[PDB]
Amino acid sequence: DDFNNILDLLINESKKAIKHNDIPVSCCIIDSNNNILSLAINSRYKNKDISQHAEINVINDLISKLNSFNLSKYKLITTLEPCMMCYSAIKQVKINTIYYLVDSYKFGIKNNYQNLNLIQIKNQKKQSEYIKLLNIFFINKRL
Amino acid sequence: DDFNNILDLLINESKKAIKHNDIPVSCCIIDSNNNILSLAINSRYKNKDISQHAEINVINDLISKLNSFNLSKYKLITTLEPCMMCYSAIKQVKINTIYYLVDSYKFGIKNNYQNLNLIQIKNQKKQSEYIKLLNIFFINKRL
Numbered sequence A, B: 001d002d003f004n005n006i007l008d009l010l011i012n013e014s015k016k017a018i019k020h021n022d023i024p025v026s027c028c029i030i031d032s033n034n035n036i037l038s039l040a041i042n043s044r045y046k047n048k049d050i051s052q053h054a055e056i057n058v059i060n061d062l063i064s065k066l067n068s069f070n071l072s073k074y075k076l077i078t079t080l081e082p083c084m085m086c087y088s089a090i091k092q093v094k095i096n097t098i099y100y101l102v103d104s105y106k107f108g109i110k111n112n113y114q115n116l117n118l119i120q121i122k123n124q125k126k127q128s129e130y131i132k133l134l135n136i137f138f139i140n141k142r143l
């Protein structure tokens, strides 16, 4: 069901990061009516910037659009559960909800954490496609 | 005693952030022989970038200098105890030691946290000067 079109776009965009050896992650920020306002992909290693995960990129995008650091009436949708750096960045701009498709433990160590709802997206098919994408990425990099 | 000259430089540099309404924070990264390799100040609101705290700025500086994300044989010296976003960024580049002059609770909420030593700098005089700086900043902004 949920976010089928949005997840289609995010999954398709996350592939663009594989060129530059970045983990394929993409995310967007939506308003109360599920309109996408900002879209971003992971570009840390592409631009040699420790901060340029997809989450911080989309946050900075909406900040530039609104000329405001208060993003409290928007929500974030990401393909992969954010890291603690990006999690803290999300809480500092006052976004109260993170929808994620794949949790942080399927490919790594679980994150340890009130003011922020962390919701798993129910869409086994999109989740399966994206997990396939990540598996291919990691095994092709171990090469 | 400790880091008297380095703290003099950091405190003097942190003043440059007050122009652009940024919290006066400055930091550097040193090697095993206490040579400064990278120096940075806080510029979040100056450049509308949620990530541009002084810690992430100095990390990105050293990354550009070394063309490497492995900073495990360097340590970080900051005037103010880092936030959790910057803390996670520091741990992700594998810096194992953070020297801080003023802890996070004197002006805010205490941070809640192994692989990372968090050391308070013993220098009551520099600490007093910097605390004075921060007090003047915050009260002048409440205006």
Ligand SMILES: [Zn+2]
Pocket: A053, A054, A055, A082, A083, A084, A085, A086, A087
């Ligand atoms: Zn992240």
Ligand SMILES: [Zn+2]
Pocket: B053, B054, B055, B082, B083, B084, B085, B086, B087
């Ligand atoms: Zn910070």
